Amino acid sequence: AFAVDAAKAYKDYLASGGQPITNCVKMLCTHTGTGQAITVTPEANMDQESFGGASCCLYCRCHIDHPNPKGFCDLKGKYVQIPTTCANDPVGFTLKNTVCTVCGMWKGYGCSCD
Amino acid sequence: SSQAWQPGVAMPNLYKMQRMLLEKCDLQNYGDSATLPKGIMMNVAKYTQLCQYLNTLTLAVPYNMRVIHFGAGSDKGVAPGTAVLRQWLPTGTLLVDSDLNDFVSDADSTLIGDCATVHTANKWDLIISDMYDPKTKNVTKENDSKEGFFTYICGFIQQKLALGGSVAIKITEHSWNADLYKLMGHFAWWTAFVTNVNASSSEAFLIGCNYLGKPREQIDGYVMHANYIFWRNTNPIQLSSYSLFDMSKFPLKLRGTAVMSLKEGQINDMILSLLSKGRLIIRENNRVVISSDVLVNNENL
Numbered sequence: 001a002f003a004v005d006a007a008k009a010y011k012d013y014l015a016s017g018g019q020p021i022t023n024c025v026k027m028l029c030t031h032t033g034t035g036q037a038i039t040v041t042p043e044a045n046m047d048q049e050s051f052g053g054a055s056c057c058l059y060c061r062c063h064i065d066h067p068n069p070k071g072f073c074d075l076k077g078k079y080v081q082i083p084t085t086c087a088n089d090p091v092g093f094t095l096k097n098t099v100c101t102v103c104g105m106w107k108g109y110g111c112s113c114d
Numbered sequence: 115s116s117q118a119w120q121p122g123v124a125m126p127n128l129y130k131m132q133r134m135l136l137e138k139c140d141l142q143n144y145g146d147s148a149t150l151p152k153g154i155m156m157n158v159a160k161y162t163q164l165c166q167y168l169n170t171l172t173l174a175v176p177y178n179m180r181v182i183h184f185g186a187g188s189d190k191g192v193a194p195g196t197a198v199l200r201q202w203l204p205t206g207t208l209l210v211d212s213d214l215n216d217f218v219s220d221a222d223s224t225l226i227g228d229c230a231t232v233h234t235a236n237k238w239d240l241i242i243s244d245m246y247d248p249k250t251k252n253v254t255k256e257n258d259s260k261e262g263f264f265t266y267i268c269g270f271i272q273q274k275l276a277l278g279g280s281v282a283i284k285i286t287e288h289s290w291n292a293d294l295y296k297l298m299g300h301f302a303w304w305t306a307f308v309t310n311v312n313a314s315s316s317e318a319f320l321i322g323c324n325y326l327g328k329p330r331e332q333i334d335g336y337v338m339h340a341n342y343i344f345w346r347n348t349n350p351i352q353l354s355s356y357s358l359f360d361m362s363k364f365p366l367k368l369r370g371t372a373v374m375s376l377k378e379g380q381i382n383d384m385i386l387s388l389l390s391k392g393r394l395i396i397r398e399n400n401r402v403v404i405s406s407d408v409l410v411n412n413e414n415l
């Protein structure tokens with residue numbers, strides 16, 4: 001019944017002042033994109049940076065199994081748009097936040113469905 | 115002086131035609147650092163400028179294009195060049211990458227190990243290599259043609275590059291190979307391309323554009339590398355990151371280039387003309403299968 005909870009480990013490490021995972025791969029782009037959260041090509045808007053998805057995925061970067069019976073990664077091979085205000089910690093942002101299954105924006109950072 | 119607004123500078127044709135002897139490379143801005151946009155890694159800027167230049171050539175871009183990228187890892191364990199290539203290439207393009215050392219990648223498949231362990235059934239439409247031997251820094255004699263991964267790359271090109279396909283293989287003053295230059299003459303066109311962000315380095319990408327599978331031109335590669343160093347030695351390039359700011363036309367155009375299987379007997383001059391113009395790829399269009407050779411040892415006793 002034992003499994004490592006790496007998401008919690010990183011969340012607590014951050015909470016206690018640890019420096020975020022670095023070397024997330026930031027892309028050059030127009031910054032006139034849709035602003036959707038996770039895309040097949042960079043889609044940052046004026047308020048976002050775009051990153052290569054693998055480099056922003058805690059499981060990819062930590063060499064650990066993905067939380068998924070199939071182990072499928074929803075970031076690798078795509079681009080993640082991160083609010084510029086949070087781009088110091090893309091891995092933390094993707095862990096803590098959620099994508100709206102309807103409009104494809106981050107809940108709280110673009111999703112206007114409510 | 116408009117060179118600064120380009121992605122970089124390609125070796126002018128008149129320097130290719132010379133017969134120079136090899137000198138030491140002595141760049142006036144050697145090692146100077148470009149000012150990159152905030153938070154952008156060198157390899158992202160470098161690969162962006164490489165792709166921007168490749169947008170000016172006649173690359174074949176088929177549906178289900180196949181691209182392989184050697185030397186794709188970093189000491190940081192991520193793959194910035196692969197991320198730029200996948201951004202540049204049409205969505206759905208099959209992208210495989212590889213490196214000696216472990217890294218995580220946005221590529222569809224990644225093989226870790228010496229490139230000589232990498233094998234594949236299929237032919238490829240574009241080959242990218244950024245491999246460089248750290249021991250090349252231990253310069254202790256005349257600058258001779260290097261082997262190692264360059265020997266693999268030449269064979270891989272001759273064996274596994276589709277006709278019409280293209281390559282970009284990173285070289286430097288001391289990281290180079292005479293047979294790779296010679297093989298540039300087996301393409302419809304070739305150059306040595308220096309990125310504006312790394313204009314202070316003797317790095318260049320040797321680009322073969324539209325592979326013909328036979329020599330169009332006989333190139334002595336010892337002479338051509340000397341020509342390249344001569345060009346670099348006498349043509350200072352000012353560092354520039356200007357082109358990084360305009361990404362509106364960055365994506366590689368999906369040309370839908372035709373793929374045909376054809377046997378070595380059906381390649382006539384009209385076919386060769388289509389290949390030369392970026393208008394045809396010739397290879398099987400089967401499924402893509404790759405593998406890494408694994409050496410087995412039991413170290414007990």
Ligand SMILES: *O[C@H]1[C@H](O)[C@H](n2cnc3c(N)ncnc32)O[C@@H]1COP(=O)(O)OP(=O)(O)OP(=O)(O)OC[C@H]1O[C@@H](n2c[n+](C)c3c(=O)[nH]c(N)nc32)[C@H](O)[C@@H]1O
Pocket residue numbers: 139140141142144246247248250251253286287288289314315316317
């Ligand atoms: O961006 C680098 C790229 O990732 C790779 N690379 C270089 N070192 C690497 C290591 N240790 N590991 C992995 N990958 C490495 O190669 C790219 C280019 O690196 P760069 O340092 O800019 O290459 P460069 O110095 O131009 O060419 P060489 O490495 O082949 O030269 C070896 C040796 O010769 C002297 N040298 C070369 N050049 C062009 C010189 C010059 O213009 N002026 C002077 N005074 N000396 C020059 C140097 O001693 C150099 O180290």
Ligand SMILES: N#Cc1cn([C@@H]2O[C@H](CO)[C@@H](O)[C@H]2O)c2ncnc(N)c12
Pocket residue numbers: 184185186187188189212213214215227228229230244245246247248262263
């Ligand atoms: N010599 C050699 C090789 C160097 N590299 C890599 O190129 C990258 C160079 O900047 C680096 O990440 C390195 O690890 C190789 N990769 C596979 N096979 C090889 N034979 C090599």
Ligand SMILES: [Mg+2]
Pocket residue numbers: 145146147312314315
């Ligand atoms: Mg440099």
Ligand SMILES: [Zn+2]
Pocket residue numbers: 054057058059060061066073074075076
């Ligand atoms: Zn992942």
Ligand SMILES: [Zn+2]
Pocket residue numbers: 100101102103104105111112113
């Ligand atoms: Zn929504």
